[PDB]
């Protein structure tokens, strides 16, 4: 499995930088899951533990990192082909509870991708609302 | 890295 060793290294690597990360590091943590992509459910899988543990201003990164993911794999294996989103979809309620122990500040950019993956049909519709929701409900707590 | 940047060829 030395392909997920390459990406987890790529992934951890987020650490030794600080955010805002560059298109740069994030093209080649994108890379590395696509070249593991016989072992997406090993690449979703570190996605979603890095969310879990990951330091409050890592919280976006991760999410950049799905959204980067799934967006490349569209584009290189096909909109309706693409493993990822599916994958992705199955914990995202928990993956997202992870994500908005983000700073206060950092909620917004988390709802900006939400609308992106909305407007663009990246995640199914049922899927993107109630994380929607989910942010909302905060702003009132 | 921005949202809306398009994905590498």
């Known amino acids: 499995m030395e392909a997920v ?15 805002p990360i560059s298109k740069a590091k994030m093209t080649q943590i994108t890379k590395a899951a696509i070249k593991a992509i016989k072992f997406y459910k090993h690449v979703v899988q570190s996605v979603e533990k890095f969310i879990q543990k990951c330091k409050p201003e890592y919280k976006v990164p991760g999410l950049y990192v799905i959204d980067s993911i799934v967006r490349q794999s569209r584009h290189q294996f096909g909109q309706e082909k693409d493993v990822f989103a599916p994958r992705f979809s199955n914990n995202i309620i928990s993956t997202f509870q992870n994500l908005y122990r983000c700073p206060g500040d950092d909620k917004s950019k988390i709802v900006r991708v939400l609308n992106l993956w909305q407007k663009n049909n990246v995640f199914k519709s049922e899927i993107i609302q109630p994380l929607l929701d989910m942010a909302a409900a905060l702003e009132h707590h | 890295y921005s949202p809306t940047s398009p994905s590498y060829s």
């Open chain 1, 5 to 19: 060793k390459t990406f987890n290294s790529e992934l951890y690597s987020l650490n030794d930088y600080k955010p």
